[PDB]
Amino acid sequence: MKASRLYTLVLVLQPQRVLLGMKKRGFGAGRWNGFGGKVQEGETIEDGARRELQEESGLTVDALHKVGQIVFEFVGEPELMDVHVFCTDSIQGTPVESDEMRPCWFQLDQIPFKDMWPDDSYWFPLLLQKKKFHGYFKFQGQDTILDYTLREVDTV
Ligand SMILES: Nc1[nH]c(=O)nc2c1ncn2[C@H]1C[C@H](O)[C@@H](COP(=O)(O)OP(=O)(O)OP(=O)(O)O)O1
Ligand code: NA
Ligand code: NA
């Protein structure tokens, strides 16, 4: 069995658009993603997701709703990424560009799947339908899925 590290991912999803962030620097630059990062000691997962949304995008929110959980496994990495996925309830403020991330709105008929993590093509349609999900994806590198599971659930 493997150890897992906790991460968050937040989708700012409105009726006609979604906010994504383009990673600007380092390895993995050029891909659009939700907002999030590692959970820290002592905070709840939801509070970590709110904190990461603010640090990464400048947006604050009073509350999130949990919509999914996805485990990522990468060839050559023994540690699993356990990603807890949330959708915003309502947002305050404007998103802000940083040196690491550029936020941008996309209409929901222009979701930029080819420039997102490949797994998003599978689970983000469920998120758009207001369904909840559990997933697992094993990657070779950044682009190639070797194995995956995806299941709609009634409780995350
Ligand atoms: N396959 C994938 N599909 C996806 O949609 N999001 C993914 C993904 N793999 C990783 N992510 C997201 C999860 C999380 O929001 C982020 C990874 O977190 P990071 O390692 O950037 O966290 P931190 O910024 O806290 O890390 P530090 O560099 O230690 O500060 O990318
Ligand atoms: Na962090
Ligand atoms: Na991050």
Residue numbers in the entry: 1 to 156
Q: Which lines from the publication concern this structure?
A:
Here, we report the crystal structures of hMTH1 at neutral pH in complex with the major substrates, 8-oxo-dGTP and 2-oxo-dATP, at 1.21- and 1.20-Å resolution, respectively, using our hMTH1(G2K) mutant (it contains a homogeneous N terminus), which produces a new crystal form while retaining the hydrolytic activity. In the 2-oxo-dATP complex, on the other hand, 2-oxoadenine (2-oxoA) is recognized with a different hydrogen bonding pattern from that around 8-oxoG: the 2-oxoA base is recognized via two hydrogen bonds with Asp-119 and a single hydrogen bond with Asn-33 and Asp-120, respectively. The O2 atom of 2-oxoA, which is the characteristic feature of 2-oxoA, is recognized via a single hydrogen bond with Asp-120 (distance 2.6 Å). In addition, Asp-119 forms two hydrogen bonds with N1 and N6 (both distances 2.8 Å) of 2-oxoA. The side chain of Asn-33 shows two conformations, but the major conformation forms a single hydrogen bond (distance 3.0 Å) with N3 of the base. Accordingly, the position of 2-oxoA is shifted toward Asp-119 by the two hydrogen bonds with Asp-119 as compared with the position of 8-oxoG in the 8-oxo-dGTP complex where Asp-119 forms a single hydrogen bond with 8-oxoG. On the other hand, Phe-27 in the 2-oxo-dATP complex is far away from the 2-oxoA base, and the electron densities of L-A including Phe-27 are less obvious than those in the 8-oxo-dGTP complex, i.e. L-A in the 2-oxo-dATP complex is more flexible. The binding mode of the triphosphate moiety of 2-oxo-dATP is basically similar to that of 8-oxo-dGTP despite the difference in the coordination of Na+ ions and the loss of interaction with Lys-23. As the results, in the case of the 2-oxo-dATP complex, the bond length analysis showed that both Asp residues were deprotonated. We could not judge whether the result was true or not, because our X-ray data with low 81.9% completeness and 1.4 I/σI value in the outer shell were not satisfied with the criteria required for the bond length analysis method.
